[PDB]
Design a protein around this ligand. Sequence first.
Ligand SMILES: Nc1nc2c(ncn2[C@@H]2O[C@H](COP(=O)(O)OP(=O)(O)OP(=O)(O)O)[C@@H](O)[C@H]2O)c(=O)[nH]1
Ligand SMILES: Nc1nc2c(ncn2[C@@H]2O[C@H](COP(=O)(O)OP(=O)(O)OP(=O)(O)O)[C@@H](O)[C@H]2O)c(=O)[nH]1
Lengths: 44, 51, 427, 438
Amino acid sequence: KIGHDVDYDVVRLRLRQRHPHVCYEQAQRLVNDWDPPTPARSQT
Amino acid sequence: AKVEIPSPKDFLKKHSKEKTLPPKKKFNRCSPKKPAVPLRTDHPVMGIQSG
Amino acid sequence: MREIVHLQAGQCGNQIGAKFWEVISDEHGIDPTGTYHGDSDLQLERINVYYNEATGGKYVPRAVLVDLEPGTMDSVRSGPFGQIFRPDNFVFGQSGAGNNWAKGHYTEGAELVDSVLDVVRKEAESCDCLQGFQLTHSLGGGTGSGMGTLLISKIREEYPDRIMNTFSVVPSPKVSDTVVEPYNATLSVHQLVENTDETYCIDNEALYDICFRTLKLTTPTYGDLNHLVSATMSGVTTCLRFPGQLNADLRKLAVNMVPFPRLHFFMPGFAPLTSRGSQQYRALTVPELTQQMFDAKNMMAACDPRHGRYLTVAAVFRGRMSMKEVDEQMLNVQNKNSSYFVEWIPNNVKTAVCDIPPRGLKMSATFIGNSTAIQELFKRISEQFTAMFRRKAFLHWYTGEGMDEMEFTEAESNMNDLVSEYQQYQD
Amino acid sequence: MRECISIHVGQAGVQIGNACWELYCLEHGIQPDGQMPSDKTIGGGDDSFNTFFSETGAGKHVPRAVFVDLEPTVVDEVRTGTYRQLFHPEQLITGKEDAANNYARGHYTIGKEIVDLVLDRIRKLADLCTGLQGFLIFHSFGGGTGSGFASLLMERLSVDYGKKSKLEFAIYPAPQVSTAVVEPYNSILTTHTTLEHSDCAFMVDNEAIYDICRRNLDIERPTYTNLNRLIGQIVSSITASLRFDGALNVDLTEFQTNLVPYPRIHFPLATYAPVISAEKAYHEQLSVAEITNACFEPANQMVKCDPRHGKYMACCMLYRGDVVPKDVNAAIATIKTKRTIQFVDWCPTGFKVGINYQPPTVVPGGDLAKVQRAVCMLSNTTAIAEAWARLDHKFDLMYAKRAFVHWYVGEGMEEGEFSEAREDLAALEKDYEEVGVD
Ligand SMILES: Nc1nc2c(ncn2[C@@H]2O[C@H](COP(=O)(O)OP(=O)(O)OP(=O)(O)O)[C@@H](O)[C@H]2O)c(=O)[nH]1
Ligand SMILES: Nc1nc2c(ncn2[C@@H]2O[C@H](COP(=O)(O)OP(=O)(O)OP(=O)(O)O)[C@@H](O)[C@H]2O)c(=O)[nH]1
């Protein structure tokens, strides 16, 4: 299930950087840290 | 008498000068004077009868 | 009896020693002049673990302090406690260094190692039976590294039975001002991995994060930073000088602690840090003590143990406690995550308890751990080295010193061994 | 006459002594000063204390013990406690270094330069000793420093004295609790050393002590104080036969002769019934039948093992206080015809009964109740095999990964002794299941 989760997150994120607005700096400011990485990795 | 300055020549070689030492042996312990405890489910002699 | 002789190096060490000595001094209860004040006795009987006696009830430090920058010495001299030190021991140098590693290790130390060695060996003869040495220094700092690798290489052979604890400061993962700091790190660690036995590694960023999260107090002082680390030193050395069981020898811990000769580096942790007002919003109870104790934010050395797994842990506790609460707390957390541990070995906790707390707070604890989380730091630095050495810029200074790149070659694969071995065991 | 000598090694062996004498002073009423009052007993040293103390002409009772440690902290502590006048200064022998929990370190690096002093002290007590039945030895299988010294000095004194019994009272490793990772190492080392030279070795575990503490004593914050208090009461019970008089008497010689069946297997268990809280005893009743039922209740034992999964070999029960053989025999017959306890087809009886009139006493400020009929339970069972069956499959793993071995090899030992301990333990189990089998 966790793979489904992460892959759906990926497809969700990518298709939002086509909008006519938005410019260079924000992209890089989210590249390394889109969501805090921590893919819950069996959290506790 | 003086300080033997190590010149900029070298250092250890790819993780050398260590303490690893597996030696091999099977040396026995002392004498367990205490004998074998069981007789392995067997018998002494008894039950001699005579009419 | 059992006694320790303290070594102080580098410009970090200048203020490190100041804060650390004043902490232990006002712990045992000595006036700034040096005359005893008897309120608790056990401290008085056990003061010989560190101090040397001076006539008229005065108690001199068994410290040996060295740098090359004289202004730091002058500031320490002027501080509100520096008078306690003894002018006999201020061995120093005759110029600056520019904290170039090659200069710091090869040219300048040649004429000072003799004096420092003679002073320390006089002290060593004077004392009775040494557990070992503790050094406060830097690994990212230049002149501390240059002198310290020399001295630690020198002393091991004469005293190969003794606990050569090294306590350092690690460069920032984000920005370090000093730029050849990488090369300092690689050259220092190359000796240190072979030579030391235990090394504590801490970094400033997490101290700042701690200041924001729990101190909350806007404008700190680097003195307050040193206080937050001097607490850790006080804790880790509590147990020797005080009664109530806990087998306290740092070697008693170390054999329990490290599984393999190339595993020396550890990641510290402190106990209750209370905010502006939470003092009366916290029920000061052992369960929540341990809750905060073992946390992702209470930790402040390098990085979250989350990314990996733990081999071993050691927790020291100071206060009027009992076995049960700590023991069952450890069982509870062991169940809570019986996964991030290593089935390699069970019950990988070491516990130690002493009854006489520090003052100000009734319960206290200190954490130290060996977990699979050093790969972050050493990876980072390894790729930094490859990138910088790619066109080997700024290496002209080292060529002039006589440094040549084969030493870089010999060191880099040692760190490769470190990374591969760390990853190899746990994975 | 009927006197014995006490030895303590490792820092686990010192609180327990401290408590044992904190009690043992009281039943003859000796103040920490060390003087019986003007009541007429003082002289050469003959009266019931004689088994414990040698009160000489100065009127000062003398413990017949030795406390050897390797770190001056606790020994100097007790030398600064109340009882410093009570103890003999050099009977408290201090070393300066720790064993690092490294058995071989403690057994070869440092063991060579204190054994002389300790054995000389043993001689200069054994000279004045008269009956010299034997010794009471306190160490710990998780020996922080006790293990190696215990093994070496025990071997030396075993070869030097071959005509008396030896008693060992060891705190056994906590099965799922460890404050030490070198614990399996030094534990099995000590086992395959001692099993051939201990005459009677008894185990006790401390998790179960806590479990009892918060089951029936109703206290939720106990410590070493209560732990060692009750343990000392247990050893007091087993020495009460020597201490006081009674209808008939028992002795450790009989304990050996009848309890242990065979050579080797000499690992019994102890149990105490009337550990009850003040309110709980206040408006409830105590007598022979219920105390025996509560004692054979499986969870009241102090080792995490199931006698229902085990099979029984031997049992010696000691009643202290006032009883009558009528109820004694009636109740023991009831238990004999009880159903869950699977006695082996071997033994038709299994019960050595001892009685003494003098009831056990309280400690000032303690926790136990004001009891009139106490009882102690010693037993040979086959149920203990589970502990070793658990230990072996941890040690095999941690040794096939051979972590931490660099310490021991660099200080002198090697893997051969570990390998030998393996099969020594194997022989232990192998004997146990077959003697358990009919
Ligand atoms: N004492 C002290 N050290 C500090 C302070 N702030 C940062 N440090 C760090 O402590 C480090 C160690 O200094 P030293 O051990 O004396 O190192 P060095 O050989 O003189 O080399 P450099 O650090 O390059 O000057 C420095 O590199 C700083 O990163 C501070 O306020 N006081
Ligand atoms: N009966 C008793 N047991 C203790 C005491 N303190 C600790 N223990 C338990 O018994 C064990 C003590 O053994 P060690 O820690 O090796 O002590 P040691 O061998 O005398 O020497 P050290 O290495 O200095 O600790 C530990 O596992 C403790 O949990 C005590 O004061 N009395």
